[PDB]
Write a structure and sequence with these properties.
homotrimer, 4 helices, four-stranded antiparallel β-sheet, elongated, alpha+beta, eight-stranded antiparallel β-sheet, about 250 residues
């Protein structure tokens, strides 16, 4: 038996809203340490990695390590029935279904759902040092990608110790954004150690941006010929990293 | 002459946005106590019963009982030219084939004057047995609508069940099941509260497609009443103001 | 070099919004006294008449009086990328392209650039039978509502009264607007200076276009006389105005 309790139900709500259109099916991998999800997107370009930790949950227990294939879209549906202040409570029974329990606080309302669960079959993500690491705000990164998605299909991200520039070009013109190294946690911090210039796909960056309601900031980690890492930290919980290789032939 | 003056024009706006995709064309029965409307839905499944009483009108005049057939879509489209705070006046002539809607704007700045084509509708008076139900549940408007759409994504049907300690709503479907439980409230101001009075535990199944229709009457009241007994239709009731009410009748699905 | 600077970029965004749906390609006629535009729409039916006087800009430069062929829809997709308190500056250098630079209010700095292109007429001054001043949103809601009733609005003006009418398959409507009186609050008041009474009939789809400029002013004026086009006027703060011209129907 596995029964984890999360006071911050909105966190689950937001995770699933993020991933629901990115992947359709994913193997949540339940452990003594916490929850882990590693997957490639349906078109097998980007790579998602979610980590939630025992310590984050109000209550956590896991007597057998589980490997649940879940339909992201169906879980999205079931969680959408939860208020953004409910105490979601996940539970299984070494397992054919996944039980969810929403508990709206300060109201005698209690919801109790069971999701049909899938048979699904990992992958490698080597923690490595990155040439440059921008910690900017989530809203601004979102904004920037949204806007440049109307000029071109791809984005050119250039970095150095003075600031970060994001560029794009299409049939309908040319465009540049220039952010400068900058107080209240709403500032840019480039810690670049090497001349990093990389091109990525705005479709998939915009897919990444949906985790924005999870963090006020977002870090972008990158080096030559190495998949970009967009990470949104969750809280006490771990993180929701996104990996995208730049386009080269 | 028929002439009725409603200060809260929003009442009529909301009544007709509630009854629009359900009923495509109804027959309003105007008389001395007020306006009544009573109609099957276009799929002949649910029954709608609106009652606006003469007392809620600032000015109520009816010289001759009317059965004026209105295309509810055209009425909604005309009432969408009325303002949330507009005083709305209904006027028809005794020998009239049109209904004149007249919207007075708050500071007398503007007055709108619309005229809507009537039509002849041959409609029988579907009877409505006056029953006493096994249990009645008072509960917030929005909370009910919230349960009813949420379960609409898990199943297409909703099993309501009633006992002295609260009321439960359940559904099943091709991705699992769900079950929402509400308890009788004591304290909750007080518009928000889930009270029940019961004579007998009931457990009935209803199509969610139609309950969601009904929940489009929510703007009308911060509460809703569910009335239930075995082998008799569910009644979902919204009081308008201390003026009348909108009632929906849905029939359960058969018992194994 | 043309270089014009505006601290309320919101105003240009609103202009491109108030124009992108009538014209696709326009010719900014830019000179020392301000920027101008006076174009017919895609169906040669309506007339649009943009005027940003240079004294309204915070930094205005014009070395020569140029005609910039500008795809308004592409200009608008670019203008979408700027913020509402943003600080927008246009530049055209020696000859060829248009540049749009948005200074975030913040550490952001945006540099967009679009291609120009290789694409007039006369509008005379006039003393109209009827001038009606009203709140922009009110006239907007009138056109919005009456569009759901019919495809043509009869606007008839007389003393103590302006009256909008329409009719269609489901019925007919007639909205009567009165001149506000002993409370003269200026931008929520209606005012009818009525030289000689008039009836005119206009297509509501074009008026409904014009109302897209509604966010530019809290008032609007309607100038109108027999057998001559109606002038819908949205005075852009205090640097110019925007003007729509529509003759009666059939």
């Amino acid at each position: 038996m596995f029964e984890a309790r999360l006071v911050q139900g909105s966190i689950l709500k937001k995770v699933l809203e993020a991933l629901k259109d990115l992947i359709n099916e994913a193997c949540w991998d339940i452990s003594s340490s916490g929850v882990n999800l590693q997957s490639m997107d349906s078109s097998h370009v980007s790579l998602v990695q979610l980590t939630l930790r025992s310590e984050g949950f109000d209550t956590y227990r896991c007597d057998r390590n589980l490997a649940m294939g879940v339909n992201l879209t169906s879980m999205s549906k079931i969680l959408k029935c939860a208020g953004n202040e409910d105490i979601i409570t996940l539970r299984a029974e070494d397992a054919d279904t996944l039980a969810l329990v929403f508990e709206a606080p300060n109201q005698e309302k209690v919801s109790d759902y069971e999701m049909k669960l899938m048979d699904l079959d990992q992958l490698g993500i080597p923690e490595q040092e990155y040439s440059c690491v921008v910690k900017m705000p989530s809203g601004e990164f979102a904004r920037i990608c949204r806007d440049l998605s109307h000029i071109g299909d791809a984005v050119v991200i250039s970095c150095a110790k003075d600031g970060v520039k994001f560029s794009a070009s299409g049939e309908l013109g040319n465009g540049n954004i220039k952010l400068s190294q900058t107080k209240e946690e709403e500032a840019v911090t480039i810690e670049m150690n090497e001349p990093v210039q990389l091109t990525f796909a705005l479709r998939y960056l915009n897919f990444f941006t949906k985790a924005t309601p999870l963090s006020s900031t977002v870090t972008l980690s990158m080096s030559a010929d190495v998949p970009l890492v967009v990470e949104y930290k969750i809280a006490d919980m771990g993180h929701l990293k996104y990996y995208l290789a730049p386009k080269i032939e």
